Design a protein around this ligand. Sequence first.
Ligand SMILES: [Ca+2]
Ligand SMILES: [Ca+2]
Length: 1020
Amino acid sequence: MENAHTKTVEEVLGHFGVNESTGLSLEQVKKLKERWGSNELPAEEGKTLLELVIEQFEDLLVRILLLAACISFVLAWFEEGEETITAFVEPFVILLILVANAIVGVWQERNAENAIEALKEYEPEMGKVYRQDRKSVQRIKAKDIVPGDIVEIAVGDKVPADIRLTSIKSTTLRVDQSILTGESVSVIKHTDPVPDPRAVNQDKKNMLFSGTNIAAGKAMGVVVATGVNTEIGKIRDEMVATEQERTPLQQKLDEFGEQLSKVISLICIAVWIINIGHFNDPVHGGSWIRGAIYYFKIAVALAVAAIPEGLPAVITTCLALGTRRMAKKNAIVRSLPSVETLGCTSVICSDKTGTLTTNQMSVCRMFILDRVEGDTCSLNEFTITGSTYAPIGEVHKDDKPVNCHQYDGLVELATICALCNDSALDYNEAKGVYEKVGEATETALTCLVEKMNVFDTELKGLSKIERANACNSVIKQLMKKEFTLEFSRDRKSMSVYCTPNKPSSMSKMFVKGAPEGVIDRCTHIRVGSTKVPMTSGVKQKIMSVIREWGSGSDTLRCLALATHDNPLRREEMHLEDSANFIKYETNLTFVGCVGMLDPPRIEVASSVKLCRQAGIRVIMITGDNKGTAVAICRRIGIFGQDEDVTSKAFTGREFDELNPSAQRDACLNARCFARVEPSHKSKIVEFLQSFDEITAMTGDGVNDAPALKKAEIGIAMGSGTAVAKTASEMVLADDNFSTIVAAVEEGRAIYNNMKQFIRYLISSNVGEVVCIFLTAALGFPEALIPVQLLWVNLVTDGLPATALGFNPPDLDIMNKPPRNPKEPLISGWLFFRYLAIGCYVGAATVGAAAWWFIAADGGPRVSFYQLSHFLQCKEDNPDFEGVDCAIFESPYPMTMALSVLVTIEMCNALNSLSENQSLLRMPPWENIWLVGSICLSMSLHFLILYVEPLPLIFQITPLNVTQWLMVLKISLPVILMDETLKFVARNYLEGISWPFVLLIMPLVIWVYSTDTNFSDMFWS
Ligand SMILES: [Ca+2]
Ligand SMILES: [Ca+2]
């Protein structure tokens, strides 16, 4: 109750009214369930809306527009009160794009958070308990655990709640409690109650802390506190403390963000400086102060246009899309920017079991020795059907279903399988399919015994529930176990001491482990029902079939099973160190060996092939035999079926017996590792990083945390420990290897979408800057006023720019070598692409304005000289006759310049679906969000042109069809010019959608029906 570690185990059982064996009764469970509450903590939402919005407005670029909106508001404080929605339009069209980007970023970020949270509940924490529903060990959800329930634990199996250890079945318990209180030291558990009711957590040597992890051993006990009463809900705080650790790309964008603002501020100053002369013009009012304020309004309005204020919104949108796509693929991304650096992965080191294989181990081949003939002998190679845990199948000698009792070896072999077994088979009635409780290898033996049915028990009339534990139950009733020995790494075996139930003592100490260790530690054969000494001939024959089973095209993991005919008594047994265990299993009697298949997932074979296609090296690191590991590598495609592996396959011992000069060169070439220990996994990361490589190490255990932290990218496991998850940048809920390759592909797509966004705004907004500077050089009248410049920013830098975050993945996204973070964000060739497009956009806007002045049917025919010197327009001027000075302030040239600038940048947005794929390969409807944004932006432009009260505000006027065709005649070639730029990059630097082509051909022909050209160019 209050002081759990003060009362005796019998006392706590009596207080709860529960027995260890039978467990809590159904009435007891339902009483306690509604009395205390479910074993869960009150989970709060991640971020509130207000703090989510403030996060949108914290970058430099967005904050700059907040200042410029404030400047434009205070600058418009000369005609106030009387004017309401006329002068204050300039601040409004700056805040409009700010909230348009913020809402999209907030909407996407909320959607990404929701996708993760639904994935958390998709796989529930599952706990093993004993109840009155069924006698055998059963699994229940962790949230359904109520105090007082008897709960068993094993290796791994994250502790559900505070439990009072009733008995320690294993020899020793290793528990890591650093996740909760920070003490990494392993603590020896015991049943002695702590005298101090307020004992320090360090003194708590008998409590399994809630939410912690168990390194090794199995224990039994009763849960005392569930949910809020656990110290994981009281002692710890909210733990709202995360470190961004800015991605090398994020540091680049911040550096590019500040570098751009320095360049933009220099340009906007230059606009003011190069416009000193036009300060005393009569249009400004004849006062120099008013002249210096108007051109300052252009200076800030150009800054609002030129600065890419959508950069924070498109990065958040791109990352949130990447996270949501991963959550749909059952992959939790803890830190949002980390999904970007996955695209940069160059080496993927992954464990074999669980990640590269389904971990659905099932016995398919097994053999026992038939007879011995001189040096050689004979075998009984059996084939057994059934690739799942369901205990249905028949054994085949060659093709015939064989009786169990026909062979004395089979019945003896099943006893070793069943008695040395530590797992069991559980029938999940909720899903209707059998499930494993414990190690997969051990559970495979359990269903093997049920299939054989050595005792020939009548299985026809038995229920489905008892099908799982029918043969194991009867075989254990006749023949019981006393105690077991812990499986140690050096021994590579696990043994058990047993004594028959009936008073015969015919005690046999069964063994089980790796074929190499067991065979070398046995000196006899149980040929049927007789003992035969081990010779040199049977040395090779047993090894020959095992290597054939393992190294063969079926990839069998074998386990030699033997018996200790004359074991030592428990008086001389020592349970202190692994040294005792290795010398306690000698002169064993080999009876036979089994074989389990671990089938690689169907999609793993293709994913490994795709990684080699994208330039990603895949390394498989496993504790399996080297011969088996190489065969499994060849099976999935890491190694070719006829490839030399004399320098790519390294074992743990082989790696260690090398000088560091060869070790470094080994990691450059090595593609698989076998029989390693957690010290090597961190060593491999260090050697790969020394090569300037981005590694994605896969780990699930507590000892893998140093490897995951040192790795550039750490990927945990859904069924793994909690310590690895908190030290990883990604968690695979589905425990699938192919999702790693999908994450790399998505990370590459996220980077490309930012490059398209940067390309679109830099190449378009530099054209806006060129327009103002080219006009000043040519002496032409002003092309755009501040409210027209701010409208172009709202239309062309807002939703159309952000929609590039939803771009479809590129065609050859996975056909190129991984990106190097060392190279700069923008290459030299991309600067040429930005300038070339921007140069045309700027020249198009000036040319469109001069088109109306010079060669327009509906306007005057002012020559180039009279336009380049329009400030000399005088009635008495000898070279100015037939043109009035009022025509140089008409809104047609500004509407011609505005509409071209908007439209030519909408067409440029169509060029930004891919860096090098033409519009023919990718039609614009691949990105339906972009097409919708383009249509909305053009709809907005038409709204302010042909709605009566609006054009006065923006100082523009409606355009007829003849002028609109000229807008399209100049805007369209930005597509053609960029297609040439893409074509040069496609071919000279290193499929056509016919329905799209036949759709735009009528458009191009109709637009290019007539043509108008200029004349008398003197200075240009
Ligand atoms: Ca802008
Ligand atoms: Ca723009």
